[PDB]
Amino acid sequence: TGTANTLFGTASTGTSLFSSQNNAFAQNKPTGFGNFGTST
Amino acid sequence: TGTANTLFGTASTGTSLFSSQNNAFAQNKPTGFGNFGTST
Amino acid sequence: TGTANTLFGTASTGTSLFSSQNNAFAQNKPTGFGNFGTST
Amino acid sequence: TGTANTLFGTASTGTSLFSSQNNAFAQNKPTGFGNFGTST
Amino acid sequence: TGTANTLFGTASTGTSLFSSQNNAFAQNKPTGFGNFGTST
Amino acid sequence: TGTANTLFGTASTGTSLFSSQNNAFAQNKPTGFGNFGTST
Amino acid sequence: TGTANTLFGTASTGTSLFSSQNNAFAQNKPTGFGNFGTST
Amino acid sequence: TGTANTLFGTASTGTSLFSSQNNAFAQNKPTGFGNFGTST
Amino acid sequence: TGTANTLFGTASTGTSLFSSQNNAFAQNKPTGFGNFGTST
Amino acid sequence: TGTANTLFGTASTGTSLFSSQNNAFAQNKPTGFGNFGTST
Amino acid sequence: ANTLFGTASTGTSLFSSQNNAFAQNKPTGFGNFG
Amino acid sequence: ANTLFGTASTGTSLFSSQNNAFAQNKPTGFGNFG
Amino acid sequence: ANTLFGTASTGTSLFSSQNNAFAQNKPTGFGNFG
Amino acid sequence: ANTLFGTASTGTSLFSSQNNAFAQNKPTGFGNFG
Amino acid sequence: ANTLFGTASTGTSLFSSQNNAFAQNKPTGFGNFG
Amino acid sequence: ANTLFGTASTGTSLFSSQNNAFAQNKPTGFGNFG
Amino acid sequence: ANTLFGTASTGTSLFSSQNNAFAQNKPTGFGNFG
Amino acid sequence: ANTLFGTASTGTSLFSSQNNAFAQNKPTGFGNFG
Amino acid sequence: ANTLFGTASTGTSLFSSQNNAFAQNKPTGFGNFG
Amino acid sequence: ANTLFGTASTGTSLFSSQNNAFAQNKPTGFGNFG
Amino acid sequence: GTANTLFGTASTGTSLFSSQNNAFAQNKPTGFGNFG
Amino acid sequence: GTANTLFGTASTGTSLFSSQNNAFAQNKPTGFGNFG
Amino acid sequence: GTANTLFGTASTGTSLFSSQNNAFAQNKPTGFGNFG
Amino acid sequence: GTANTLFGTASTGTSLFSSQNNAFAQNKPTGFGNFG
Amino acid sequence: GTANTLFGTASTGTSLFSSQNNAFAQNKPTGFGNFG
Amino acid sequence: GTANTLFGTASTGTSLFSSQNNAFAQNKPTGFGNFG
Amino acid sequence: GTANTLFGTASTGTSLFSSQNNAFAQNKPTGFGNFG
Amino acid sequence: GTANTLFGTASTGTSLFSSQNNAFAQNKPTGFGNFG
Amino acid sequence: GTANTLFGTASTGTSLFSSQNNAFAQNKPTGFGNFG
Amino acid sequence: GTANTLFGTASTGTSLFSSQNNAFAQNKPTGFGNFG
Secondary structure, eight states: OOOBOOSEEEEEOSOEEEEEOOOOSBOSSOBSOOOEEEEO | OOOBOOSEEEEEOSOEEEEEOOOOSBOSSOBSOOOEEEEO | OOOBOOSEEEEEOSOEEEEEOOOOSBOSSOBSOOOEEEEO | OOOBOOSEEEEEOSOEEEEEOOOOSBOSSOBSOOOEEEEO | OOOBOOSEEEEEOSOEEEEEOOOOSBOSSOBSOOOEEEEO | OOOBOOSEEEEEOSOEEEEEOOOOSBOSSOBSOOOEEEEO | OOOBOOSEEEEEOSOEEEEEOOOOSBOSSOBSOOOEEEEO | OOOBOOSEEEEEOSOEEEEEOOOOSBOSSOBSOOOEEEEO | OOOBOOSEEEEEOSOEEEEEOOOOSBOSSOBSOOOEEEEO | OOOBOOSEEEEEOSOEEEEEOOOOSBOSSOBSOOOEEEEO | OOEEEEEOOEEEEESOEEEEEEEESOOEEEEEEO | OOEEEEEOOEEEEESOEEEEEEEESOOEEEEEEO | OOEEEEEOOEEEEESOEEEEEEEESOOEEEEEEO | OOEEEEEOOEEEEESOEEEEEEEESOOEEEEEEO | OOEEEEEOOEEEEESOEEEEEEEESOOEEEEEEO | OOEEEEEOOEEEEESOEEEEEEEESOOEEEEEEO | OOEEEEEOOEEEEESOEEEEEEEESOOEEEEEEO | OOEEEEEOOEEEEESOEEEEEEEESOOEEEEEEO | OOEEEEEOOEEEEESOEEEEEEEESOOEEEEEEO | OOEEEEEOOEEEEESOEEEEEEEESOOEEEEEEO | OOEEOSSSEEEOSOEESOEEEEOSOEESOBSOOOOO | OOEEOSSSEEEOSOEESOEEEEOSOEESOBSOOOOO | OOEEOSSSEEEOSOEESOEEEEOSOEESOBSOOOOO | OOEEOSSSEEEOSOEESOEEEEOSOEESOBSOOOOO | OOEEOSSSEEEOSOEESOEEEEOSOEESOBSOOOOO | OOEEOSSSEEEOSOEESOEEEEOSOEESOBSOOOOO | OOEEOSSSEEEOSOEESOEEEEOSOEESOBSOOOOO | OOEEOSSSEEEOSOEESOEEEEOSOEESOBSOOOOO | OOEEOSSSEEEOSOEESOEEEEOSOEESOBSOOOOO | OOEEOSSSEEEOSOEESOEEEEOSOEESOBSOOOOO
């Protein structure tokens, strides 16, 4: 809820739910998430 | 909910749900998400 | 919900659901998402 | 819901659902999404 | 829902569902989406 | 739903469903979407 | 809730729920999350 | 709740729930989280 | 609740719940968390 | 609650609940936490 | 006296977008001079 | 006296977006001169 | 006297986004001169 | 005298986002001159 | 005299985000000159 | 005289985030000149 | 005279985050000149 | 004269975080010149 | 004269964090010149 | 004259953390010049 | 040399003494004054 | 040399003595004054 | 040499004596003054 | 040499005597003064 | 040599005598003064 | 040699006599003064 | 040699006589003075 | 040799005569004075 | 040789005659004075 | 030889004649004086 202010970069204030960030020089099959089976 | 303000970059205030970001120099089959089977 | 304001860049306030961003120098078969089977 | 205002760039306030962005220098078969089978 | 205003660029407020953007220097068979089989 | 106003660029407020944008310097067979078989 | 302000970098104030970040020089099958089966 | 301010780096004030960060020079199958089965 | 201010580094004031950080030179199957079965 | 200020490093004032940090030169299956079964 | 009764209900919306703009007294004047 | 009764209900929205903008007295004047 | 009765209820929203903006007296003047 | 009665209730929201902005008297003037 | 009655209740929110911004008298002037 | 009655209650929130910002008289002026 | 009545109650919050910011008279001026 | 009545109660919070910031008269001026 | 009545009570908090910041007259000026 | 009535009570806190910061007149000036 | 855009502006000739004032709000922006 | 963008601006000719003032709010921004 | 962007600006010609003033709020930003 | 970005700015020509003033608030930022 | 970014700025030409003043608030920031 | 970033800035050409003043608040920051 | 970052800055060319003044508050920070 | 970071700065070229003044508060920090 | 960090700075080129003044408060910190 | 950190700084090139002054408060810290 508080004010974010950078000068050169990223100012974030939001809520990030479920964020995957796999990051390398070399990767083999990087997956973010799996399958989503939703019922109602 | 708070104010974001950069000068050179990214000011974000929104809510990011389910964000995958796999990033390398070399990748092999990077997937974000899987299958989505939704029923109602 | 809060105000975003950059000068040179990206000011975002919206909600991003399900965002995949796989990004490299070299990729092989990068997929964002899978199959979408939806029934009602 | 909050005001976005850049000067040079992207001000976004909308909600982005299901956005794939695979981006490299060299890619081989980058797919955004899969198949969409929808029934009602 | 909030006001977007850039000066040089993109002000967006709409909701973007299902947006693929695969973009490189060199690509081989980049597909956005797959097949769409819809029944009712 | 909120007002978009750029000066030089793109102000968008509409909802974009299913938008593929594969764009490179060199491409080979870039397809937007697949086949559309719809029955009723 | 308090104000964040960097000059060169990342000022964050938002709440991040469920954030995986596996990052190396070389990885083999890095997954962020698993499967999501949700019912209501 | 208190003000964070770096000059070159990361000023954070938000609450981070459930953050996994496994990071090496070489990894083999690093997973952030497991499966999510949620019912209501 | 108190003010954090570095010059080169990380100033944090937020509350971090449930943060795993397993990090080596070489790892084999580092997991952050396990499975999440939640009911209501 | 008191002010933290480094010059090169980490100034922290927040409360960290449940933080695992297993870190070596070589590890084999380092897990942060176990399974989370929550009911209400 | 002018009245507007407006409703816009959707039921079971999947992968959809609904924008509802209930504006009351929204004038737009481009050039107001004097 | 002008009144607006506005409602926008959705039921069982999956993977969806709903934007509801209830504005009252929202004028927009581009050039106000004098 | 102008009144706005606004409601926007959703029930059982999965993976969704709801934005509700209840603005009252939101003018926007680009160029105010004199 | 203008009044706004605004409510935005959700029930059983899973993996969702709700933004509720109740603004009262929010003007925006770009160029105020004199 | 303008009044705003605002409420935003959620019940049983799992893995969700709720942002509630109750602002009263929030003007924004970009260029104030003289 | 302008009044704002604001409430934002959640009941049984699991793994969730609630941000409640009750601001009163929050102006923002970018360039104040003279 | 402007008044704000603000409340944000949660009941039975598990693994959750609640941020409540009750600000009164919070102006922000970027460039104050003269 | 402006008043703010603010309360933020939680009951039975497990593994949770509550931040409550009751600020009164918190201005922020970036560049004050003259 | 501006007043702030602030309370933040929790009952039965397990494994939790509560931060309560009751600030009164907290200005922040980045560049004060002259 | 501005007054702040602040209270933050917890009852039966297990394995918890409570931080209560009651500051009065806490200004922060980064660059004071002249 | 040559300049290729697909969208946007491709410009080849050199550009000298160019003023531009970009804001959301400007009071008396000038590029140039008087010559001689 | 050559300049290739797909979107945006590709510029090849050199650029000398260029002023630009970028803000959200400016009081009397000038690029240049008087010549002789 | 050559410059390739996909989005953004690709620029090949050299750039000399360039002023830019970037802020949220500026009082009398100048790039350059007077010549002779 | 060559410069490749996908997003952002790729620049090949050399850059000499460049001023930039970056802030949230500036009172009279100048890049350069007077020549001769 | 060559410079490759995916996002951000890739720059190949050398950079000499460059001033930049970065703050949240600046009173009269100058890059350069007068030449001769 | 070569410089590869994925995000951020990749720079190959050498950099000489560069000034930068980084603060939250600066009174008259100068990079350089006068030449001759 | 070569420089590889994933995020941040990869720099290959050598850097000589570089000044930087980093603070939260500075009164008249200078990098360099006068040349000749 | 070669320099690999994942986050942060990878730098290969040598660095000579570099000044940096790091504080929370500085009165007249100088890197360098006058040349000749 | 080679330098590998995951986070932070990996530096390969040698560093000679480098000054740095680190404090919370400094009155006139200098790296270097005058050359000739 | 080679230098491996996971977090922090890995440095391979040799370092010669380096000054650093570390305090909470310094009055006129100098690294170096005058050359010739």
